[model samples]
Target: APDEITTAWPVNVGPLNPHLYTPNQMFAQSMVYEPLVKYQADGSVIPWLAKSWTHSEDGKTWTFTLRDDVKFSNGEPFDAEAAAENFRAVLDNRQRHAWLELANQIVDVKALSKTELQITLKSAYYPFLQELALPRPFRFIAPSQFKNHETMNGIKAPIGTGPWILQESKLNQYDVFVRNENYWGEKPAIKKITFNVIPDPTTRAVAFETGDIDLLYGNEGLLPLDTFARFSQNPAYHTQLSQPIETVMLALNTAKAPTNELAVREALNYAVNKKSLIDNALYGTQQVADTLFAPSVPYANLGLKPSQYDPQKAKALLEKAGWTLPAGKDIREKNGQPLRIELSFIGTDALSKSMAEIIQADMRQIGADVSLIGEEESSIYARQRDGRFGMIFHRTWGAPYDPHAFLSSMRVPSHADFQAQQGLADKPLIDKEIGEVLATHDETQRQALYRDILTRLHDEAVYLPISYISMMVVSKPELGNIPYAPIATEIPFEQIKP
Candidate 1:
């Protein structure tokens, strides 16, 4: 199996059901499912399943001319009817996809012909194509994989129009994905890909050294930065970093007692030593950021003032807001409540733990007690969705998600974006502007709306932007063409030349 490449993933990598709220399934789901459109690195959408598409003047309806020859890995035809069933199945399980704005707007999905598909929406959603281009929740799965014609039951297995199919899998051990011979696109020369679920980062890095794995995907949190620093310095390995794909930040819980105070939120923003975190925890690979979205993302950079590191200013801000550091008391007290907040991270990730500890130390310098909450990735995601934490780590969904779909998610109470701003006086207005921004297609109008929205969020200090994350991949020198998939979470193993 010299030609077969090996990679490492988390033990909780998947349920492999593309329709449901399976956490950390991006790597596996991207291989087994196929979306109608492909999101480009330049923030554009191109043909994937749907070869061509047209929109009505009102943007409420869309028609797509799908490729006639594409086939699911199971040898099922990827026609309009099959595609409609997939969309309806997703709609049937819409609550799982409530965070997706496009999912809520979908009124109907129907087959106009064997090779044509139609989608009707309740209102004009300009980012519909881009939303479909996301790695999951909109991607199509073969009808045969559905559990008794229900997404509620989850899929029987991973089956789709993608280039690879899960041939064999052992839960928490490994997964063998073979190339789809019946695929209509450019066939992959690599025959098989083996994903070994290595939960421990140090062990995963050791596997790379011991020849247990051939590739490590940095975008999916598979590669440790400290390891990347060491590996890149060695000549035996090769490293590649993708464009800054997303923003790494902590979503402040405005609904909570302490962070709900505007002064506390402002203090937290100034309290974080972004530079030290970037240099030490990130190992100088990523740059510190002041805004929630990186400037590389369209309309995200409007020259808003940066949040300079000022722990003294942070203490001053706290004192101004009536939070006092009484004599002999380590933590500031405000109305008898301690100035303490919980910082949560994925327990399995070494980098996440390092960052959390670093942030914890910095918060302590400002007389705030920072408690570290390390838990499983899924549990952390649940806390984020429910706003059950004082502060938790999160990242933007990159490219197509940046200014639109991500903003749309802010309206859903189940989403952390909405919950993080729960105590904001302008929460209703923020939600209103998001709906308006997404509805309008006018370039000038959209930019104006975004500026207002981002400026308000920036001033409110609802988030503490850490750094922009770039995709990093470490591979053996002999492996050919170690390229990045436009969507950061995707692993283009089939396209890897052996």
Candidate 2:
């Protein structure tokens, strides 16, 4: 076997804290930390750390039966008490998972026995089981790592019962994970896995050619679509597109001017050519999206249609809203105000420039002025929390989070979804429904609530869903177990072979 199964990551996989959703870290955490339950490929929940579970008639209290033989790599028993401690650590600091809905919903956690754990919630949470299977926050962390018994502030190290452990790292360079000898589950044949930090996508391909990387999987857009095709024809490499495609959208900030106008939002959605964006900017590698959530996500398949790309239709909407294109003028004006708006994206992603330019030209054709605003990622996140931008490039968190956890986050004023829906006349009503959907126990009622909420967002044109893409897993032939896991966060290195 090769000395190590090498892979590439775009950035540093931070301190390996499960609380941090900086994708890389969470991806790594997926291997190091095990949840009480696991999110299956089909988006259903199954036993993992906990062997089985049941809930009370009230549906607010749950009890879990854990595997008695499991132990953390640090040699701590993976008992009910340990799981309860991990739950409280996150419960005490709820900022990260507050958006995830689990943090606020949990009432208290108790260890019934060495092998049994009980948790009581304030009320029945429809997606409580699936939320526990989320990649971070809900994942267990050894008590030794918590600072003052709080994981939100800091963690001393990465230690858990999963199959792999971070044996070494070089800051912005690479991280090496070795097999956990104490793992209770079946061990992976490959003992060592090295994740090299290669910032540029093109360089990642180069690394694969030069043997610096033996595998490159799980990064969305990390291997460009064109490059994926190139690898498919090679005899020595294996390639596949990941399941559970991610939803990409142009998030329109409802509270912001111009975009705040329903007519303007509808016009902009109709004006942008989704087909062209998918075929060109995405290199014909993604599927066009019409709704914020895809059907694959549970309860998201509610029948709804977005404005199709029709320039005349877009212009008519603008014209009727008093934004008429004056004779020789280039842009439409309502109250002597031009139909102008800003679209924001992260500054360093040069590829976004192409997509933004395409929208700018399309909007111009409809007599509206579209400008681009590129800011660093942190700045853009801050803008999202503050509801500052007219429009922004966005994507939905796929699988386990969507249709429930992701939808629940929409009510939090600190999230981009809330900021984008803040200007709606019935914003409070929408929030109320989301709150209701989460606590509703009846299956039919829950689905109906989801349909209502998703339908409302689409009708208002709060977001323009453009395309859907998935992770591309590419590797050398020697890595025999290469199927991409359905859960976006995991690669299952423990299941890979020699």
Candidate 3:
């Protein structure tokens, strides 16, 4: 009988094509695919699809030689031409797509032959190789896969060159990943694997506790402290904690009510009690972050101080801006219109939800009619761009080592920042700063320029910095060799075993 694996949520599988993909979708499809390169636990590059690579002195060019023994799931050859074509399709389809925004970051790709391919970047792109290591959609696919396949099972019912391949998927149910007998690497120890999309933390915990699930948790905060304590005391299971590469954030809408006012935005920043939230609500589970870039990145601006918590200052700023609250009321009104506004947050992300409540209480104390709206994450962004909400509770997940990957996406004019090509919000200066930083090949120069960008990002308060979240993954006790990269880009799935 086939082993059945289930998930807490739905997996759209994204796309098989490497160029046009997003991390969320990629994670789901990764088992079905592989990347050209991968990072070891210490952040060193290792060959995957491409056996070896070399760079010219000018620094703009890269030559990658394909492995002689690679083949696709359908038995199509995985070669240099396939690599080049995949990117060509990504570049061709990048515009106006939220998921493929990463594609615009690429310059150009060309294949010299079946064994060799050349990539001439727009610039140094420090994280290019690291990004390439992202599984499946981040991995190379044949030109035919791009042309023949629809955007189906980029995750579930997926296909890949890795040690495992998705054999079957029951929509809204479970995924069965069987070991690839013809796998190029050492055979995965776990012969059959399953992925369950159970989104309810309580249910997930119960499943783990009752043996319905082998292991559970995205991080420590997935469960209440009492439950975490219980798990900590159990000898049958152990809890492991590691700092993740992502950020938790509260972003102001540049186009909406009250939040559109920069002073009001500043006041909200001042009103937030980050320390209190970290200590009490989050149970001291994360690091207080002050900038867009995490501390791990090379050129992060460590000098900037986090915004101070001051309700008096926040109230004064609101008063100056003509907002006043009558006694015993939660809403503030200016010119007869209540200073009331909605702060939309996602219900699925545990951290974002918990922080939303904390921020909401702080805003309530100051008499701002701020109400928390918990909904799907994508819906929150949609409402934000549509100007339907006053504020948004959001966080961008960054792959720590390459701060540029996350930073550039936040540049107001970039694809992630403003969906303007689809609807217009412009910040050419922010875009230029990102470009300058990425275009330079010199590590020193890039770091210096990044410092300036970080300062500007903080000064402008583009996104309210919340905390650097630490993620925890629950696995069977038998699994060993799990490693952590300081930047914590990702876990070595290939090396994991049970």
Q: Each model's C-alpha lDDT?
A: 0.85, 0.83, 0.63
Give the residue spans of candidate 1 off by over 4 A: 12-15, 376-379
Candidate 3, residue 385: the lDDT equals 59
lDDT of 3 by residue, 1-498 (tens): 213322233343433344444534555456656777766655667887888999877666889988878777767777787777766655555553333234555677888988898888655666668667655344655556544443333322234566666666565566566677788778765677666655466767776777666654354446554466567668887676676557777666656666666667778778888889888667766777666667775567467777788899989988889888868666788878887767777777665677777888888777676777889867866775554666665556555335666666654443334531122133566567667776677778777778776776566566777778776655446564355533343334445555
Choose 1 or 3, whichever is better by lDDT. Answer: 1
- Model 2: worst 10 consecutive residues (lDDT sum): 218-227
Best by lDDT: 1
Error of 3 at 412 (Å): 7.1
Tell me the tens digit of each residue's lDDT in model 1 across 286-368.
87889988777788879988888999999999999988998898799988889999888888777888889989899888889
How displaced is residue 357 in candidate 3, in Å?
Answer: 3.0
Model 2, runs deviating above 4 Å: 20-24, 233-236
Clashes of 2: 0
Kindly list the per-residue Cα lDDT of model 2 for residues 394-479, writing each as its tens digit: 87877767767777888888989999999998899889999998898888888888888989998989998888777777888877
All models, RMSD in angstroms: 2.1, 1.8, 4.1
Cα displacement (angstroms), candidate 1, residue 274, comes to: 1.3
Q: Kindly give the number of clashing pairs for every candidate.
A: 0, 0, 20
Predicted structure with the largest TM-score when compared to the true one: 2
